[PDB]
Write a protein that binds this ligand. Sequence first.
Ligand code: B6W
Ligand code: MN
Ligand code: MN
Ligand code: ZN
Length: 456
Amino acid sequence: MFLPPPECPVFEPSWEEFADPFAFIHKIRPIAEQTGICKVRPPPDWQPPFACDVDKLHFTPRIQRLNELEAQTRVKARDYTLRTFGEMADAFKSDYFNMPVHMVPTELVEKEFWRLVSTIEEDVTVEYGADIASKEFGSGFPVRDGIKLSPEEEEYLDSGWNLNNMPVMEQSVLAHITADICGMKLPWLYVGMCFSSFCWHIEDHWSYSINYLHWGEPKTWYGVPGYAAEQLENVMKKLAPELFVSQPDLLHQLVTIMNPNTLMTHEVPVYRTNQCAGEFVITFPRAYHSGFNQGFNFAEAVNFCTVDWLPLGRQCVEHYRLLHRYCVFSHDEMICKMASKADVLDVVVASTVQKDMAIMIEDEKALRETVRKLGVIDSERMDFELLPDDERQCVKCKTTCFMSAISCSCKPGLLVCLHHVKELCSCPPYKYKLRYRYTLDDLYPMMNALKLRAES
Ligand SMILES: CC(C)c1c(-c2cnn(CCNC(=O)CCl)c2)[nH]c2c(C#N)cnn2c1=O
Ligand SMILES: [Mn+2]
Ligand SMILES: [Mn+2]
Ligand SMILES: [Zn+2]
């Protein structure tokens, strides 16, 4: 038996409220960050086109077994068209229930999902699509291409809710990152079938995410507020300890399906929703979420980072260091990139970046004093941003270095961050070298330029 979590908040903004997505998200944040996820129904005449030929859209399916607490990975031959995938998917669901696909109630599919995942006798496997846009299978929103668009497609080209606009919109600081981090910054396309499932996870760097269901049967979500993130992790550590073995790569972290009733039993707040076609789901920083598809559908989702998020992004990279997990990008490098563009930044952005930069500079001053007292005397400026990420990771904690690192002539090519000076080599301290991107004297005017831009 299954007891459905309480429903998450649903917002129905008017057009005035809906027009600017970042202003609207900021307004709902007090309510929505208490539930981790929320649903947004756009005003009734915001309806972007869905004009695809299912016979020309191709993608490589992925296979999924459905066993509660079984380890699965994040995704990185075979081929379906959207038509043949849809036909396989609909026949699977109608054969599974011996009913037409739409008369299966969502409550029932939900019940049956949690039954089949917990029964070891059942060996159900399903297939799904998950990838970024490609020439073989593009975004569900209109994009610019030199094909003629209808005036209705043109209406939605520059919408803030056209998710293709997210990796380039001013108020997502992720847009400032020059590094090509395609897996994180670009929209993902999700082609679902009944019971295809996304395991419990938070987004990289604790970013927000936003998900739009273009068409098809609904997507069922479970969400946990960011404040209960460690509570949830402790519950999963106890019940599925195999998922917490230290992982060699970011593409090797383990995730799993877990009944939300199990989390509720252990006092973790969980909320649910059925996302229907034309609706958005927003996940907030560090809000765990999982779910499954009710049947054949097509969704598009993207990460983003508001100024709200900057302190949490710093807190996240700290937490990655404690865990020895790889970063997707350097947070400090992104801060300094924005500082170098201060004259062009939005004034509220400049004020918030400035506050994060002050913490960064004080933390960095203290760390350099600590390593100097360990006998590291030699030093040389180094343009960390020119190194491929895997050439500038701390040997100990895997963090991506940018502000500074320690090298040692006895272990050429290796780096540690300033927390792990004692982990690099066994040579005497005068053979170590501090490699730094900026002097403290470079840094204070960078921050000052942000204060000027903000105070205007
Ligand atoms: C079932 C698919 C189409 C799907 C996925 C998804 C990605 N990867 N896998 C395989 C299992 N691994 C993990 O879930 C890694 Cl954490 C599923 N993610 C998501 C999200 C999210 N956020 C929302 N809708 N949505 C989907 O409908
Ligand atoms: Mn099973
Ligand atoms: Mn997600
Ligand atoms: Zn380190």
